[PDB]
Amino acid sequence: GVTIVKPIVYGNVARYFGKKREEDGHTHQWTVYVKPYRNEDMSAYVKKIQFKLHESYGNPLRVVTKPPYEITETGWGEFEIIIKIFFIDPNERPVTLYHLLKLFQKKTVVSEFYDEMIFQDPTAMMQQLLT
Ligand SMILES: Cn1nnc2cc(CO)ccc21
């Protein structure tokens, strides 16, 4: 059979403001993302990536369809973000990732994980799109 492995990295970077912010108490800017391990345009084969934030955010289900696959926000809190990757072939099961937003230990805060999206015997059309 055919196995196509698409390596990815996901997670977040964060920047401390320098001071807590009086008007909302946010302390950090952060960006949560998915990106390919090697430079490729994932929109060849990815329909959309959903980023589900803590429900205390407005419009906590954030959707990106065009790279880069990232969401930039501010806040004070750390919580899991559910990252769901949907494919152009609706018969390819979506990939669900789970990421704990990291804001704390000058140096940019980074928490980034490697993973692999495995396509076992895709349609010939989806094969072309993955290669
Ligand atoms: C959980 N958390 N952390 N920081 C937050 C900021 C907002 C929007 O002001 C909502 C929820 C937040």
Distance 124 CA to ligand 1 centre (A): 44
Ligand 1 atom nearest 79 alpha carbon: 1
Q: Phi and psi at residue 126, in whole multiples of 5°?
A: -65, -35
What's this structure's resolution in Å? 1.6
Nearest to 45 by CA among 11, 88, 74: 88
Q: What's the CA gap between 64 and 51, in Å, rounded?
A: 8
Q: What's the CA gap between 9 and 65, in Å, rounded?
A: 17
Q: What's the CA gap between 65 and 46, in Å, rounded?
A: 8
Nearest to 81 by CA among 24, 18, 14, 7: 14
Instruction: Give the residue, by CA position, lying nearest to ligand 1 atom 6.
Output: 75
The alpha-helical segments, DSSP class H, found in the chain are: 124-130
Question: What token pair was written down for 30?
Answer: 């952060």
* Identity at 46, one-letter amino acid code: V
How far from each other are the two terminal CA atoms of the chain, in whole angstroms? Answer: 16
Query: What angle is formed at CA 114 by the lines to CA 109 and CA 115, rounded to 5 degrees?
Result: 145
**How distant is the alpha carbon of residue 129 from its chain centre?**
20
Structural element, H or E, at residue 80: strand 80-87
Question: What token pair was written down for 125?
Answer: 């059309």
Domains of the chain: which residue ranges?
A: 1-131
